[PDB]
Coordinates of C-alpha atoms in Angstrom, one line a residue:
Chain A
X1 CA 90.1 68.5 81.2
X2 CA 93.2 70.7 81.5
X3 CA 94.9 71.9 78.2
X4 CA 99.0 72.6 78.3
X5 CA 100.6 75.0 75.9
X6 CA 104.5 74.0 77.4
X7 CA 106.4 77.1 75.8
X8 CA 105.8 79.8 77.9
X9 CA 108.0 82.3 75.9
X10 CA 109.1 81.9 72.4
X11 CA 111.8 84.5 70.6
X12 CA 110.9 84.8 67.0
X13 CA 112.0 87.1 64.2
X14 CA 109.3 88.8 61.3
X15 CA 108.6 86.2 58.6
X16 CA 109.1 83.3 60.8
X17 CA 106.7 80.2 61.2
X18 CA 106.1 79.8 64.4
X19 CA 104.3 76.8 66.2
X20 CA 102.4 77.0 69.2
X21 CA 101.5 73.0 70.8
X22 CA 98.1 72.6 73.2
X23 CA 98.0 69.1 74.4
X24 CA 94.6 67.5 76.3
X25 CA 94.4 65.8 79.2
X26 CA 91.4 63.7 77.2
X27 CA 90.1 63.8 73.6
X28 CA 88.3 67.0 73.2
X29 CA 86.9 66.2 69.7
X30 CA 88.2 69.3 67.8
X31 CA 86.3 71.5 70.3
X32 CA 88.8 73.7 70.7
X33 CA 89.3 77.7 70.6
X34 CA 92.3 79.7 70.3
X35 CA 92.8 83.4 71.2
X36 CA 95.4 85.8 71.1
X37 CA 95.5 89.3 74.1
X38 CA 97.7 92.1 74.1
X39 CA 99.1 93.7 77.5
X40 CA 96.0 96.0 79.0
X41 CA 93.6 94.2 76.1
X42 CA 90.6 91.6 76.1
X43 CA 91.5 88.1 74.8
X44 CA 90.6 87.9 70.9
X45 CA 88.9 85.4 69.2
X46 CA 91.4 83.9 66.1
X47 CA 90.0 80.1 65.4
X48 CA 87.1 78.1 67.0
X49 CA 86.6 74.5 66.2
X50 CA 90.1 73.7 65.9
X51 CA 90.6 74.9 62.6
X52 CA 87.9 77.7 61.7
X53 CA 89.4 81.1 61.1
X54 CA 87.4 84.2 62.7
X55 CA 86.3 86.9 60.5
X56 CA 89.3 89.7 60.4
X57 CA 92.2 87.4 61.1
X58 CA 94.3 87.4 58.7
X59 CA 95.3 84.4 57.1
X60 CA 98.7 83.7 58.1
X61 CA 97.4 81.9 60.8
X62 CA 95.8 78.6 60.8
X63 CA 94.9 75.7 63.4
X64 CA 95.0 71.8 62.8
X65 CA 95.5 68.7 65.0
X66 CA 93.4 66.0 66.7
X67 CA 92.1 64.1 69.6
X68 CA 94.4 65.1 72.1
X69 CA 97.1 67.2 70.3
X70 CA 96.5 70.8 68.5
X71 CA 98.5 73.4 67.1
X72 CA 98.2 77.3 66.2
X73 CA 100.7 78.3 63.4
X74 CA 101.7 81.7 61.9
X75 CA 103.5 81.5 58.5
X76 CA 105.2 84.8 58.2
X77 CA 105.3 86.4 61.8
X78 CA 104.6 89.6 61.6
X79 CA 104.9 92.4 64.5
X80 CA 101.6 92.7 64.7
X81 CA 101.5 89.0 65.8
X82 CA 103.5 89.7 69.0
X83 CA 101.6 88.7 71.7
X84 CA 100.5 85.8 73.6
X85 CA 98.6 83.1 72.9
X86 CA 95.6 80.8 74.7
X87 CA 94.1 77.7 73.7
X88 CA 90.9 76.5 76.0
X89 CA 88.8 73.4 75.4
X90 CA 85.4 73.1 75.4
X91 CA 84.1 69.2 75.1
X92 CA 83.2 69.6 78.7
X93 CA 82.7 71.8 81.7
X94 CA 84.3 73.3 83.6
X95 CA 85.5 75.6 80.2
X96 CA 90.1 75.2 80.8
X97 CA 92.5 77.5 79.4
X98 CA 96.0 76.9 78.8
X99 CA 98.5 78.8 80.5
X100 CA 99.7 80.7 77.7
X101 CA 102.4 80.9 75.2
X102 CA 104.3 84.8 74.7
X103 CA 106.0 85.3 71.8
X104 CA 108.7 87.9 72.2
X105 CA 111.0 89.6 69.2
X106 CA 114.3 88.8 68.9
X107 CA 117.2 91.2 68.1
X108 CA 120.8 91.9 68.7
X109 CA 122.2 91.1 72.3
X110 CA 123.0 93.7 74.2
X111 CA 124.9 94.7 77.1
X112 CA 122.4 96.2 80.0
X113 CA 123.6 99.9 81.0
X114 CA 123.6 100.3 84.8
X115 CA 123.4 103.1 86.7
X116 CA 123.7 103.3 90.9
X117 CA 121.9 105.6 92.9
X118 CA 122.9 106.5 96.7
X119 CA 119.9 107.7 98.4
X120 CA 119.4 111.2 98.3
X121 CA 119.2 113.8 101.3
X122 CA 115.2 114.2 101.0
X123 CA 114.7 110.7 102.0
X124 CA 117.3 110.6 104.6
X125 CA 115.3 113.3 106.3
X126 CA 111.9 110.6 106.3
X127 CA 113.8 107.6 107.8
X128 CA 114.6 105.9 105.1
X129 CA 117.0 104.7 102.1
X130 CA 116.7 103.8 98.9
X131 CA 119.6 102.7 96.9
X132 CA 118.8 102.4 93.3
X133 CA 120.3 100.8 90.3
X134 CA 118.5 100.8 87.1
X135 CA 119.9 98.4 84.6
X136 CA 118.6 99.5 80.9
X137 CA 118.3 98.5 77.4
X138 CA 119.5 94.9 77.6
X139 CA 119.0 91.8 75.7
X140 CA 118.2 88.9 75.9
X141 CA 115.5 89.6 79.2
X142 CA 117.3 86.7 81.2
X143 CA 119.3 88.8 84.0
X144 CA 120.4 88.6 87.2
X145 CA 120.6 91.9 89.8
X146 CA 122.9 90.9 93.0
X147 CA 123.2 93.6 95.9
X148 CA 126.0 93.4 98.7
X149 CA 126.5 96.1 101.4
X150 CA 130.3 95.4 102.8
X151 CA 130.5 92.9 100.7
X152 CA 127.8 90.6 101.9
X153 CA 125.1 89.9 99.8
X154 CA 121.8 91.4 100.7
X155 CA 118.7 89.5 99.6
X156 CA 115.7 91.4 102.3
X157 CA 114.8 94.6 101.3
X158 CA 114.9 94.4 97.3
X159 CA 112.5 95.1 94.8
X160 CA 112.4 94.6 91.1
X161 CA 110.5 95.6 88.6
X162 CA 110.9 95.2 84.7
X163 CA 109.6 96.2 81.9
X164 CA 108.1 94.4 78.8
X165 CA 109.6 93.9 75.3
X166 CA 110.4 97.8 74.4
X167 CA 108.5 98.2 70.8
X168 CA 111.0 100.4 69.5
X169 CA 114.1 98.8 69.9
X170 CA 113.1 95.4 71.7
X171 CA 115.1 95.4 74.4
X172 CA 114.3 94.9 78.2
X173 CA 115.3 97.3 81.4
X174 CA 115.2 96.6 85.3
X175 CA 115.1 98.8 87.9
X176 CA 116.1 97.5 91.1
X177 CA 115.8 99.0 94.8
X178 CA 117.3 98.3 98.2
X179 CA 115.7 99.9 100.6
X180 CA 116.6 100.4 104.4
X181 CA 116.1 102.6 107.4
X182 CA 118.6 105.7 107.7
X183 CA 120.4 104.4 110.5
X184 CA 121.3 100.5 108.4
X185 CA 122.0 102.6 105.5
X186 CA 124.5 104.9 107.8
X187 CA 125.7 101.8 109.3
X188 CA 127.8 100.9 106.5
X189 CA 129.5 102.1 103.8
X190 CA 129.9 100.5 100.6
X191 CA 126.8 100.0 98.3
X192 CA 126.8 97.4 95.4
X193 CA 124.6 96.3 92.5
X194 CA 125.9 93.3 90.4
X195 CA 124.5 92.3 87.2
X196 CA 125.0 89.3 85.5
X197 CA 124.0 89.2 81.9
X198 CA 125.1 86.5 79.1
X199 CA 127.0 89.7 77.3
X200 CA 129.6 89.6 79.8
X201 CA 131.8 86.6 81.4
X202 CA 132.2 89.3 84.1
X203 CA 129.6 90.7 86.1
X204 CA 128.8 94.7 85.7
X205 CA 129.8 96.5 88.7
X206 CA 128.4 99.6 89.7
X207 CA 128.9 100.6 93.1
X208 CA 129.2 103.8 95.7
X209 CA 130.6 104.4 99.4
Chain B
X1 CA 77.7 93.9 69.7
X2 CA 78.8 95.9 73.1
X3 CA 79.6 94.5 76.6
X4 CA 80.5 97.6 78.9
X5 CA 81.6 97.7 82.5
X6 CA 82.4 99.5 85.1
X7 CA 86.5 101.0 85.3
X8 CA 88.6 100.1 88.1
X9 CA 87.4 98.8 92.0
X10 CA 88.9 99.5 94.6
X11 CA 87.8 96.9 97.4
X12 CA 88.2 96.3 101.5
X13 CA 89.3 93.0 102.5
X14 CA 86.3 90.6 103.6
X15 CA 83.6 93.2 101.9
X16 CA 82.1 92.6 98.4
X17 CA 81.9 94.2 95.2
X18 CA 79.3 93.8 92.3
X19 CA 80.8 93.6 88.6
X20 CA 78.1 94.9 85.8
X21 CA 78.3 93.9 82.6
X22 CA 76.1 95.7 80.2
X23 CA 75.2 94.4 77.1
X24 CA 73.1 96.1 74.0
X25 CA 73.2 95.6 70.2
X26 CA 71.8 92.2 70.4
X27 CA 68.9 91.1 72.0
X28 CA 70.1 90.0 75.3
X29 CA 68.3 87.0 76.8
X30 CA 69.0 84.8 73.3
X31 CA 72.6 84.7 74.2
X32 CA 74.1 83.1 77.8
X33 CA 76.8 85.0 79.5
X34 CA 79.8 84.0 81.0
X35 CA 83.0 85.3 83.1
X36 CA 86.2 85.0 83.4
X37 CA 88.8 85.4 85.7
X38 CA 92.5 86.8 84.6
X39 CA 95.5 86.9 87.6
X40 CA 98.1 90.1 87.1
X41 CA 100.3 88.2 84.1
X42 CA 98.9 85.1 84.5
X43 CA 96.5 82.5 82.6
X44 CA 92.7 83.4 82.3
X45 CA 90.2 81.1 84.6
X46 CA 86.7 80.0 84.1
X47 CA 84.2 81.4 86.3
X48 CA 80.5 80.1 85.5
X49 CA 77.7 80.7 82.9
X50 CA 74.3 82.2 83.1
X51 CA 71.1 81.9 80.8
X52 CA 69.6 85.5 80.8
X53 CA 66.0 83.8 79.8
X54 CA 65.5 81.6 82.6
X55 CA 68.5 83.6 84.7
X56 CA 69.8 79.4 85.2
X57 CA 73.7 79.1 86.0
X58 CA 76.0 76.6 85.9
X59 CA 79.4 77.4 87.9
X60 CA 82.6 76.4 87.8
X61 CA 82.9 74.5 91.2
X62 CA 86.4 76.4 92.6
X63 CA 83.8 80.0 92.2
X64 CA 81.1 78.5 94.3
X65 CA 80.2 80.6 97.1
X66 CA 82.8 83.1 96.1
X67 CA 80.9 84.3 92.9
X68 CA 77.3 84.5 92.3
X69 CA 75.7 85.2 88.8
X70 CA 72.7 87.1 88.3
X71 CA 71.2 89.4 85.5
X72 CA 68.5 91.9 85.0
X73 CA 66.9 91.1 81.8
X74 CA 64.9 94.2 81.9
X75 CA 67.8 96.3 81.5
X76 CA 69.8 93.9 79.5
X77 CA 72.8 93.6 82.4
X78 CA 74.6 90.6 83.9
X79 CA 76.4 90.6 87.3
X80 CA 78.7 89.2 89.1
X81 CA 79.1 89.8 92.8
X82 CA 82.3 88.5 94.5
X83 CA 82.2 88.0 98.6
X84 CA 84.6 88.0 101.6
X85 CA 87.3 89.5 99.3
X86 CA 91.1 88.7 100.5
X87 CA 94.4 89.4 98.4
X88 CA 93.5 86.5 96.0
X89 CA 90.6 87.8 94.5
X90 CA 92.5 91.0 93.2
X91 CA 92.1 90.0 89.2
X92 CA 90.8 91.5 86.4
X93 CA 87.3 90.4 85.8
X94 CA 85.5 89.8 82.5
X95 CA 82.2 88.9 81.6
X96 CA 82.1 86.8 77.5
X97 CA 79.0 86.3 75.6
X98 CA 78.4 83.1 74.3
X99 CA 77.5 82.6 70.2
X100 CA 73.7 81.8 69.8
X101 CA 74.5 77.7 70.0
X102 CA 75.9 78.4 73.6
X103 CA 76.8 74.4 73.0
X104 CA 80.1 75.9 70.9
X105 CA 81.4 77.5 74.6
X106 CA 83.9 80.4 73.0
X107 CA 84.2 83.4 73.3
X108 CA 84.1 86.0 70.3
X109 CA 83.1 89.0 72.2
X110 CA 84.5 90.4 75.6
X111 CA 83.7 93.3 77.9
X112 CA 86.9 95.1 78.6
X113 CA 87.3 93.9 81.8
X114 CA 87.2 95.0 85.6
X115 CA 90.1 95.4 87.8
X116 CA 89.1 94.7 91.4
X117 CA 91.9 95.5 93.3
X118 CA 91.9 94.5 97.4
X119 CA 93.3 96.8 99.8
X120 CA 92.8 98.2 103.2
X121 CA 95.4 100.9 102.5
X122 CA 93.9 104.5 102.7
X123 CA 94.6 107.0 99.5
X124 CA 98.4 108.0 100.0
X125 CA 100.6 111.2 98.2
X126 CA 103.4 109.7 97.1
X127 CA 107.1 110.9 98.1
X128 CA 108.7 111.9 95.2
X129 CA 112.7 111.4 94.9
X130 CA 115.3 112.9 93.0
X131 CA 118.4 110.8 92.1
X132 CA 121.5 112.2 90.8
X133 CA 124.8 110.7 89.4
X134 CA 126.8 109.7 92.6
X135 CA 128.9 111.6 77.6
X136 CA 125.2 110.7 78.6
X137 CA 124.6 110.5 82.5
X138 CA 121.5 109.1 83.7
X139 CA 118.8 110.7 86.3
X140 CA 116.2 109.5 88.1
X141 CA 112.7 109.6 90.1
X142 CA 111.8 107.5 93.0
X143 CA 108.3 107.5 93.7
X144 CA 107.7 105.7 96.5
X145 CA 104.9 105.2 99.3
X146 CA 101.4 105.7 97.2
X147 CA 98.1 104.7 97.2
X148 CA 96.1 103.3 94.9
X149 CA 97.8 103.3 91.6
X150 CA 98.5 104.8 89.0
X151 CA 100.9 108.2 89.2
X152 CA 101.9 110.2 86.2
X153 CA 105.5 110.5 85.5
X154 CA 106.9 112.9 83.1
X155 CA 110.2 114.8 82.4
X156 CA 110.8 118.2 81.8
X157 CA 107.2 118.3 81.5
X158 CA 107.4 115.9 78.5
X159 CA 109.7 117.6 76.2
X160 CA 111.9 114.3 77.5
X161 CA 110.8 111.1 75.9
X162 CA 113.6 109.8 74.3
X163 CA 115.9 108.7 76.6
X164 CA 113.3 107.4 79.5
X165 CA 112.1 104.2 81.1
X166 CA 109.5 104.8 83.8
X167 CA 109.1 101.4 85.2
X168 CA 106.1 99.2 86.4
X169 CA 104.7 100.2 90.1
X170 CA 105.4 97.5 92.6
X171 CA 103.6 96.8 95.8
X172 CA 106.5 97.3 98.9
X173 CA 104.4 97.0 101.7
X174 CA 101.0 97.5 101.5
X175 CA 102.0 100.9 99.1
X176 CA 103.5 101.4 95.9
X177 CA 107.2 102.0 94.4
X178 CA 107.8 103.1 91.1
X179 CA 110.9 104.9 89.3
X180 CA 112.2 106.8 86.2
X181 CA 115.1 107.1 84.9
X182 CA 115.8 109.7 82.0
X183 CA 118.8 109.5 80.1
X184 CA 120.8 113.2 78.4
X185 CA 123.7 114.3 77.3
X186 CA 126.3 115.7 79.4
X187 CA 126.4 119.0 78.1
X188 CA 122.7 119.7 78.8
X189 CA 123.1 118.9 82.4
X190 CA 123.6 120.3 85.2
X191 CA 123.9 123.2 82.8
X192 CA 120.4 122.9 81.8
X193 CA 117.5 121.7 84.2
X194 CA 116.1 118.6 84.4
X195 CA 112.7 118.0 86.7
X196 CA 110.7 114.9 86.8
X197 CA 106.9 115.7 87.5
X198 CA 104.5 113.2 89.3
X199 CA 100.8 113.4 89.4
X200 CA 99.2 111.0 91.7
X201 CA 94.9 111.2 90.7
X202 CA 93.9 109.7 93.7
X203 CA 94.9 112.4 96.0
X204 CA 94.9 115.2 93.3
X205 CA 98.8 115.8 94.0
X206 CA 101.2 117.3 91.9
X207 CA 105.1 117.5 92.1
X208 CA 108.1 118.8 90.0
X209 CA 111.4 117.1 91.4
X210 CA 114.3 119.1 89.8
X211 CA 117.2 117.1 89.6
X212 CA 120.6 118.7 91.1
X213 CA 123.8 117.7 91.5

């Protein structure tokens, strides 16, 4: 039996209602279980039995449906309540979990700042170059980092990280890297980072030679 | 109600690891025990169950082979030894105790998991950066080539909070890549110093990067 939450993100602001949806592949019979986990945490118990509250949670949320389709709401979404959320079914084995459904806060958009980094001398001296562009404080998290040396774009090489939902000021940041041997890097000259983000019609264009 | 286990494993490929999952404030074999499996940011995966009575399992078929349940009523533990490890099995691993109706299969109470993470990389330093701009200007780390994780960043030995974003390690090769940048005012720097400082546990190494021009 396999048990599909569909949203994978949802942006929500505090007070909201938000609704999660858990569809079966078969009727379960109202045995299902809902959870909520936290980045680093264990999953935590909120309803069992489709509708049961655990001791603790607080009562804005509540669970209802039937047969094949369920639903986990939250009346007044509180910070507290960012997270993300599991469903899992248990008529029959094997126990299934949804994928999960990650609420996110929503705020103001915002421009990401980007900074370019040629590699510096102490790396040069090891083999190899780093170019870095860090790309911080932006909103909404959809973004898009493009890096071309001499004007051609440069795919091999890069690596992204990002980091979660800021709880301070809910924004997002990337850092991206290019790396290459000394000799590629000295090969050519000029180093660019392109970011495209909905703030702009124009890409943001940092670059170095 | 406490389910305890071990902190995080570091694993060869093809060897195998056993998970403990100590339980006490209940009495043990009148609740079954079951694990779960949880990818880096992805969904969580049903492993199998055991009875701690009669020490009887029932698995989940995809773990066959791969997992084996056992416990130790005698000491009120349950295990879970994973085999032939390869990149795949690197999870965080968590054993759940059932309610006293095992029947109603949910999971109010969970151990706080065990990272096994799969390498064949040897304990690394890592090389430690400095990047410089080339009225706030931004600064940064590179910490690159380590092994395992985690490092320590800090700035200014953490009198800078603020304006820094020290991002999530990624694996380049078979090693790992983080940076930091810090943001400041123009008028502190260069005319003031700013030094990034990584610690890396593993290989009990400390650096101070200062950041110049």
């Amino acid at each position: 039996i396999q048990v599909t939450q569909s949203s994978s993100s949802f942006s929500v602001s505090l007070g909201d209602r938000v609704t999660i949806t858990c569809k079966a592949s078969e009727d379960i019979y109202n045995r299902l279980a809902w959870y909520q986990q936290k980045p680093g945490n264990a999953p935590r118990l909120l309803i069992s039995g489709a509708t049961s509250l655990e001791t603790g949670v607080p009562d804005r949320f509540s669970g209802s449906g039937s047969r094949k389709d369920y639903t986990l709401i939250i009346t007044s979404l509180q910070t507290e309540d960012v997270a993300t959320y599991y469903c899992q079914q248990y008529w029959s084995t094997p126990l299934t979990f949804g994928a999960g459904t990650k609420l996110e806060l929503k705020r103001a958009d915002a421009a990401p700042t980007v900074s370019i980094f040629p590699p510096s001398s102490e790396q040069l001296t090891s083999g190899g170059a780093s170019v870095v562009c860090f790309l911080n404080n932006f909103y909404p998290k959809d973004i898009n980092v493009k890096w071309k040396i001499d004007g051609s774009e440069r795919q091999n090489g890069v690596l992204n990280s990002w980091t979660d939902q800021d709880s301070k000021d809910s924004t997002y940041s990337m850092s991206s890297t290019l790396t290459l041997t000394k000799d590629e890097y000295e090969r050519h000259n000029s180093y660019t980072c392109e970011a495209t983000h909905k703030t702009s019609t124009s890409p943001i264009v940092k670059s170095f030679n | 109600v406490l389910l305890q286990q071990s902190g995080p494993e570091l694993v060869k490929p093809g060897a195998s690891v056993k998970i403990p999952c100590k339980a006490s404030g209940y009495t043990f074999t009148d609740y079954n025990m079951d694990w779960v499996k949880q990818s880096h940011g992805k969904s969580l995966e049903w492993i199998g169950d055991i009875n701690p009575n009669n020490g009887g399992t029932i698995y989940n078929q995809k773990f066959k082979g791969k997992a084996t349940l056992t416990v130790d009523k005698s000491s009120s533990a349950a295990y879970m030894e994973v085999r032939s490890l390869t990149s795949e099995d690197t999870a965080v691993y968590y054993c759940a105790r059932k309610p006293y109706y095992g029947n109603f299969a949910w999971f109010a109470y969970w151990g706080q998991g065990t990272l096994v993470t799969v390498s064949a990389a040897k304990t690394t330093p890592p090389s430690v950066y400095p990047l410089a701009p080339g009225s706030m200007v931004t600064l940064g780390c590179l910490v690159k080539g380590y092994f395992p994780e985690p490092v320590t960043v800090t700035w200014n030995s953490g009198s800078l909070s603020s304006g820094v974003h020290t991002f999530p390690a990624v694996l380049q090769s078979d090693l790992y890549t983080l940076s930091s940048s810090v943001t400041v005012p123009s008028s502190t720097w260069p005319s003031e110093t700013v030094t990034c400082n990584v610690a890396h546990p593993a290989s009990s190494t400390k650096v101070d990067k200062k950041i110049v021009p």
